[PDB]
């Protein structure tokens, strides 16, 4: 099961590629919006509640957000996967985020690293990371 969408932070910053395996966030409006990443948010197995477990993959690309230790700290990366095996329901835990609806916003908690969240900086054109000054609330926009 999946939804096609874009995500913006609570400062209306869009998400764009930073190199092949990272994302950055910045203020896009008009024609430059086409720069933004389009996601396939898949609804995967995992504990749920009225926290929904999801995976965040680039739509039609075999690249998924995932949470790993890098320099011994929880780190957000885009990770290549075998296109014959994805998407799937039972995604590996590094790829799972608990989607939380709070105050008409969304937060994405790492399933591998409890209470670490997809975050953006206030400053322009900085990496999206795993983590209050920083931003952890998003809105979703559906796309066809």
PDB file of C-alpha atoms in Angstrom:
ATOM      1  CA  UNK A   1       0.000   0.000   0.000  1.00  0.00           C
ATOM      2  CA  UNK A   2       1.525   3.431  -0.737  1.00  0.00           C
ATOM      3  CA  UNK A   3       0.914   7.145  -1.249  1.00  0.00           C
ATOM      4  CA  UNK A   4       2.743   9.470  -3.650  1.00  0.00           C
ATOM      5  CA  UNK A   5       3.651  12.720  -1.961  1.00  0.00           C
ATOM      6  CA  UNK A   6       6.006  15.543  -1.196  1.00  0.00           C
ATOM      7  CA  UNK A   7       6.988  16.643   2.297  1.00  0.00           C
ATOM      8  CA  UNK A   8       7.655  20.160   3.563  1.00  0.00           C
ATOM      9  CA  UNK A   9       8.896  21.198   7.017  1.00  0.00           C
ATOM     10  CA  UNK A  10       6.961  23.484   9.284  1.00  0.00           C
ATOM     11  CA  UNK A  11       8.907  26.447   7.785  1.00  0.00           C
ATOM     12  CA  UNK A  12       7.587  25.428   4.376  1.00  0.00           C
ATOM     13  CA  UNK A  13      11.051  24.226   3.278  1.00  0.00           C
ATOM     14  CA  UNK A  14      11.070  21.660   0.501  1.00  0.00           C
ATOM     15  CA  UNK A  15      13.334  18.624   0.320  1.00  0.00           C
ATOM     16  CA  UNK A  16      15.874  18.253  -2.498  1.00  0.00           C
ATOM     17  CA  UNK A  17      18.789  15.928  -3.278  1.00  0.00           C
ATOM     18  CA  UNK A  18      22.234  16.831  -1.819  1.00  0.00           C
ATOM     19  CA  UNK A  19      24.520  14.587  -3.830  1.00  0.00           C
ATOM     20  CA  UNK A  20      23.291  11.040  -4.587  1.00  0.00           C
ATOM     21  CA  UNK A  21      22.704   9.828  -1.004  1.00  0.00           C
ATOM     22  CA  UNK A  22      21.667  12.881   0.957  1.00  0.00           C
ATOM     23  CA  UNK A  23      18.872  15.428   1.158  1.00  0.00           C
ATOM     24  CA  UNK A  24      18.890  19.128   1.965  1.00  0.00           C
ATOM     25  CA  UNK A  25      16.076  21.533   2.774  1.00  0.00           C
ATOM     26  CA  UNK A  26      15.316  24.917   1.310  1.00  0.00           C
ATOM     27  CA  UNK A  27      12.719  27.486   0.426  1.00  0.00           C
ATOM     28  CA  UNK A  28      11.328  26.725  -3.046  1.00  0.00           C
ATOM     29  CA  UNK A  29       8.449  28.565  -4.687  1.00  0.00           C
ATOM     30  CA  UNK A  30       7.261  28.621  -8.326  1.00  0.00           C
ATOM     31  CA  UNK A  31       9.053  26.786 -11.147  1.00  0.00           C
ATOM     32  CA  UNK A  32      12.061  25.861  -8.910  1.00  0.00           C
ATOM     33  CA  UNK A  33       9.641  23.636  -6.986  1.00  0.00           C
ATOM     34  CA  UNK A  34      10.211  20.940  -9.590  1.00  0.00           C
ATOM     35  CA  UNK A  35      13.554  20.361  -7.808  1.00  0.00           C
ATOM     36  CA  UNK A  36      11.785  18.711  -4.882  1.00  0.00           C
ATOM     37  CA  UNK A  37      11.886  15.026  -4.107  1.00  0.00           C
ATOM     38  CA  UNK A  38       8.714  13.038  -4.787  1.00  0.00           C
ATOM     39  CA  UNK A  39       8.206  10.125  -2.356  1.00  0.00           C
ATOM     40  CA  UNK A  40       6.394   6.830  -2.387  1.00  0.00           C
ATOM     41  CA  UNK A  41       5.383   6.421   1.220  1.00  0.00           C
ATOM     42  CA  UNK A  42       4.743   2.754   1.744  1.00  0.00           C
ATOM     43  CA  UNK A  43       2.739   1.344   4.634  1.00  0.00           C
ATOM     44  CA  UNK A  44       4.823  -1.395   6.098  1.00  0.00           C
ATOM     45  CA  UNK A  45       4.717  -3.996   8.805  1.00  0.00           C
ATOM     46  CA  UNK A  46       5.449  -2.953  12.350  1.00  0.00           C
ATOM     47  CA  UNK A  47       3.717  -1.994  15.542  1.00  0.00           C
ATOM     48  CA  UNK A  48       0.999   0.554  14.894  1.00  0.00           C
ATOM     49  CA  UNK A  49      -1.639   2.655  16.631  1.00  0.00           C
ATOM     50  CA  UNK A  50      -4.303   5.165  15.640  1.00  0.00           C
ATOM     51  CA  UNK A  51       2.303   5.768  15.047  1.00  0.00           C
ATOM     52  CA  UNK A  52       1.883   4.240  11.603  1.00  0.00           C
ATOM     53  CA  UNK A  53       5.059   2.455  10.307  1.00  0.00           C
ATOM     54  CA  UNK A  54       6.099   3.652   6.879  1.00  0.00           C
ATOM     55  CA  UNK A  55       9.023   3.538   4.496  1.00  0.00           C
ATOM     56  CA  UNK A  56      10.080   6.567   2.433  1.00  0.00           C
ATOM     57  CA  UNK A  57      11.367   5.763  -0.996  1.00  0.00           C
ATOM     58  CA  UNK A  58      11.978   8.092  -3.979  1.00  0.00           C
ATOM     59  CA  UNK A  59       8.994   7.448  -6.292  1.00  0.00           C
ATOM     60  CA  UNK A  60      10.106   5.035  -9.012  1.00  0.00           C
ATOM     61  CA  UNK A  61      13.739   4.961  -7.771  1.00  0.00           C
ATOM     62  CA  UNK A  62      15.343   2.168  -5.828  1.00  0.00           C
ATOM     63  CA  UNK A  63      16.511   4.602  -3.115  1.00  0.00           C
ATOM     64  CA  UNK A  64      15.131   4.685   0.409  1.00  0.00           C
ATOM     65  CA  UNK A  65      15.715   6.740   3.500  1.00  0.00           C
ATOM     66  CA  UNK A  66      17.396   4.757   6.202  1.00  0.00           C
ATOM     67  CA  UNK A  67      18.822   5.130   9.685  1.00  0.00           C
ATOM     68  CA  UNK A  68      22.258   3.773  10.498  1.00  0.00           C
ATOM     69  CA  UNK A  69      25.153   4.403  12.799  1.00  0.00           C
ATOM     70  CA  UNK A  70      27.816   6.598  11.186  1.00  0.00           C
ATOM     71  CA  UNK A  71      30.698   7.684  13.365  1.00  0.00           C
ATOM     72  CA  UNK A  72      28.734   5.930  16.140  1.00  0.00           C
ATOM     73  CA  UNK A  73      25.754   8.217  15.795  1.00  0.00           C
ATOM     74  CA  UNK A  74      22.258   7.797  14.365  1.00  0.00           C
ATOM     75  CA  UNK A  75      22.470   9.124  10.831  1.00  0.00           C
ATOM     76  CA  UNK A  76      19.951   9.607   8.003  1.00  0.00           C
ATOM     77  CA  UNK A  77      21.041   8.408   4.549  1.00  0.00           C
ATOM     78  CA  UNK A  78      19.528   7.436   1.206  1.00  0.00           C
ATOM     79  CA  UNK A  79      20.309   3.816   0.513  1.00  0.00           C
ATOM     80  CA  UNK A  80      20.226   1.917  -2.762  1.00  0.00           C
ATOM     81  CA  UNK A  81      18.210  -1.288  -2.836  1.00  0.00           C
ATOM     82  CA  UNK A  82      17.638  -4.125  -5.271  1.00  0.00           C
ATOM     83  CA  UNK A  83      14.775  -2.978  -7.538  1.00  0.00           C
ATOM     84  CA  UNK A  84      13.506  -6.532  -7.919  1.00  0.00           C
ATOM     85  CA  UNK A  85      12.858  -6.846  -4.176  1.00  0.00           C
ATOM     86  CA  UNK A  86      11.353  -3.438  -3.300  1.00  0.00           C
ATOM     87  CA  UNK A  87       8.894  -2.128  -2.414  1.00  0.00           C
ATOM     88  CA  UNK A  88       7.847  -4.783   0.110  1.00  0.00           C
ATOM     89  CA  UNK A  89       5.642  -4.964   3.214  1.00  0.00           C
ATOM     90  CA  UNK A  90       8.285  -6.313   5.637  1.00  0.00           C
ATOM     91  CA  UNK A  91      10.879  -3.667   5.222  1.00  0.00           C
ATOM     92  CA  UNK A  92      14.115  -3.952   7.238  1.00  0.00           C
ATOM     93  CA  UNK A  93      14.068  -1.935  10.422  1.00  0.00           C
ATOM     94  CA  UNK A  94      16.646   0.666   9.218  1.00  0.00           C
ATOM     95  CA  UNK A  95      14.094   1.814   6.633  1.00  0.00           C
ATOM     96  CA  UNK A  96      11.075   2.088   8.954  1.00  0.00           C
ATOM     97  CA  UNK A  97       9.744   5.353  10.361  1.00  0.00           C
ATOM     98  CA  UNK A  98       6.855   5.729  12.736  1.00  0.00           C
ATOM     99  CA  UNK A  99       4.632   8.364  11.189  1.00  0.00           C
ATOM    100  CA  UNK A 100       3.042  10.352  13.991  1.00  0.00           C
ATOM    101  CA  UNK A 101       0.192  12.813  13.493  1.00  0.00           C
ATOM    102  CA  UNK A 102       0.420  15.600  16.134  1.00  0.00           C
ATOM    103  CA  UNK A 103      -1.352  19.003  15.935  1.00  0.00           C
ATOM    104  CA  UNK A 104      -2.163  18.587  12.230  1.00  0.00           C
ATOM    105  CA  UNK A 105       1.460  17.944  11.464  1.00  0.00           C
ATOM    106  CA  UNK A 106       3.535  14.855  10.862  1.00  0.00           C
ATOM    107  CA  UNK A 107       6.653  13.672  12.623  1.00  0.00           C
ATOM    108  CA  UNK A 108       8.795  10.756  11.467  1.00  0.00           C
ATOM    109  CA  UNK A 109      10.407   8.805  14.239  1.00  0.00           C
ATOM    110  CA  UNK A 110      13.142   6.308  13.426  1.00  0.00           C
ATOM    111  CA  UNK A 111      12.004   2.767  14.258  1.00  0.00           C
ATOM    112  CA  UNK A 112      15.727   1.670  14.695  1.00  0.00           C
ATOM    113  CA  UNK A 113      16.552   4.612  16.912  1.00  0.00           C
ATOM    114  CA  UNK A 114      13.696   5.473  19.324  1.00  0.00           C
ATOM    115  CA  UNK A 115      12.906   9.230  19.705  1.00  0.00           C
ATOM    116  CA  UNK A 116      15.228  10.228  16.834  1.00  0.00           C
ATOM    117  CA  UNK A 117      13.283  12.140  14.218  1.00  0.00           C
ATOM    118  CA  UNK A 118      13.668  13.269  10.663  1.00  0.00           C
ATOM    119  CA  UNK A 119      14.779  16.892  11.173  1.00  0.00           C
ATOM    120  CA  UNK A 120      15.707  20.062   9.316  1.00  0.00           C
ATOM    121  CA  UNK A 121      17.739  23.059  10.329  1.00  0.00           C
ATOM    122  CA  UNK A 122      16.373  26.591  10.453  1.00  0.00           C
ATOM    123  CA  UNK A 123      19.202  27.741   8.153  1.00  0.00           C
ATOM    124  CA  UNK A 124      18.779  27.441   4.406  1.00  0.00           C
ATOM    125  CA  UNK A 125      20.242  24.650   2.264  1.00  0.00           C
ATOM    126  CA  UNK A 126      21.452  22.414   5.092  1.00  0.00           C
ATOM    127  CA  UNK A 127      21.230  18.584   5.262  1.00  0.00           C
ATOM    128  CA  UNK A 128      18.180  16.730   6.461  1.00  0.00           C
ATOM    129  CA  UNK A 129      19.273  14.715   9.486  1.00  0.00           C
ATOM    130  CA  UNK A 130      18.204  12.567  12.392  1.00  0.00           C
ATOM    131  CA  UNK A 131      17.544  14.291  15.718  1.00  0.00           C
ATOM    132  CA  UNK A 132      13.585  22.900  20.071  1.00  0.00           C
ATOM    133  CA  UNK A 133      15.489  24.982  17.530  1.00  0.00           C
ATOM    134  CA  UNK A 134      15.662  22.284  14.832  1.00  0.00           C
ATOM    135  CA  UNK A 135      12.470  21.351  12.985  1.00  0.00           C
ATOM    136  CA  UNK A 136      10.772  17.932  13.323  1.00  0.00           C
ATOM    137  CA  UNK A 137       7.227  18.681  11.990  1.00  0.00           C
ATOM    138  CA  UNK A 138       6.148  18.295   8.389  1.00  0.00           C
ATOM    139  CA  UNK A 139       3.175  18.568   6.073  1.00  0.00           C
ATOM    140  CA  UNK A 140       2.388  16.146   3.222  1.00  0.00           C
ATOM    141  CA  UNK A 141       1.168  17.148  -0.244  1.00  0.00           C
ATOM    142  CA  UNK A 142      -0.308  14.515  -2.478  1.00  0.00           C
ATOM    143  CA  UNK A 143       0.781  14.221  -6.088  1.00  0.00           C
ATOM    144  CA  UNK A 144      -0.706  12.144  -8.890  1.00  0.00           C
TER     145      UNK A 144
END
